[PDB]
Design a protein around this ligand. Sequence first.
Ligand SMILES: CC(=O)Nc1nnc(-c2ccc([N+](=O)[O-])cc2)s1
Length: 334
Amino acid sequence: SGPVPSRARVYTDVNTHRPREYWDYESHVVEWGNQDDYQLVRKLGRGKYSEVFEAINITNNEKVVVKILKPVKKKKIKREIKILENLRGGPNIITLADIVKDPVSRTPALVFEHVNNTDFKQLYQTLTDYDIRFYMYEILKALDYCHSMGIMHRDVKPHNVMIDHEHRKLRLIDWGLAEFYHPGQEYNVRVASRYFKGPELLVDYQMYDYSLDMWSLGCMLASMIFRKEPFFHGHDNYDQLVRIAKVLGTEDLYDYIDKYNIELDPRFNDILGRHSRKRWERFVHSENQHLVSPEALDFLDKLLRYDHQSRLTAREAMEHPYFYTVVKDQARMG
Ligand SMILES: CC(=O)Nc1nnc(-c2ccc([N+](=O)[O-])cc2)s1
């Protein structure tokens, strides 16, 4: 008896009803810009499969960010490009401004708009209750848009949400793990940062969907309103699930496993032990209480659910009373 299959309860067939060339990124033909339009200024980061630089566009003197892709698979490069082009112009989605090659060595690089981001080590220390609601609503706009366009981000975490606080500007970045959703497809569960991985990933349930992004978003919310980053801090993947179960409780965890007929490694029942479901108020103290409200806790509680089918969609989340003051303030023209 294998696990019970699952499909997304919204936007299930968005790619099915779109032309092949929308989601078939291997057939995409890239049109290359000019590498000599950009000058690299300083290395911002490196990880993975790329190195990221602040750069200048020397045709107009604008700052941009250049990500040079190490020789990671061609297929992964075309997937990220196709997804960035598909989502371009969507709300709070980082803009891919150019794609270039070294003409001689054939090394590809993505060029993005620059975000002057307030460093997420600090920021989270002057953000008000209103600020959090505002930025959460903007993140939800981006997720509802990319989900509605048939795409899962799969790496939602504070490092991938750039915020230029003085311009109240937010961009969702690093689409290198993002994938097209197709119902019934079994996906790689090695995505997302450990601290933001959903239960589906940690119990190796491969037929997941957009709702994975909503778990990750719930983790960010908790860490922002309770001022504890990351909120669920496991020392490896097994322990990550234990940290979740110490809050959400083991009873609902086993009901989840039971519903999808999922088989856990023997050692898990050993280290998961037995834990009550805690009240969210347990994490409210003098220092974070100004960021917490009944609305906030009701919202968080509908995001952080084991069962991926029972979590709010991005759209439903934007309807939540937590955002009432944001939404009325954002209804304009100028
Ligand atoms: C000061 C500073 O860090 N500015 C930045 N502005 N946009 C950035 C960026 C955009 C996209 C990606 N990406 O998508 O992988 C990475 C980084 S970084």
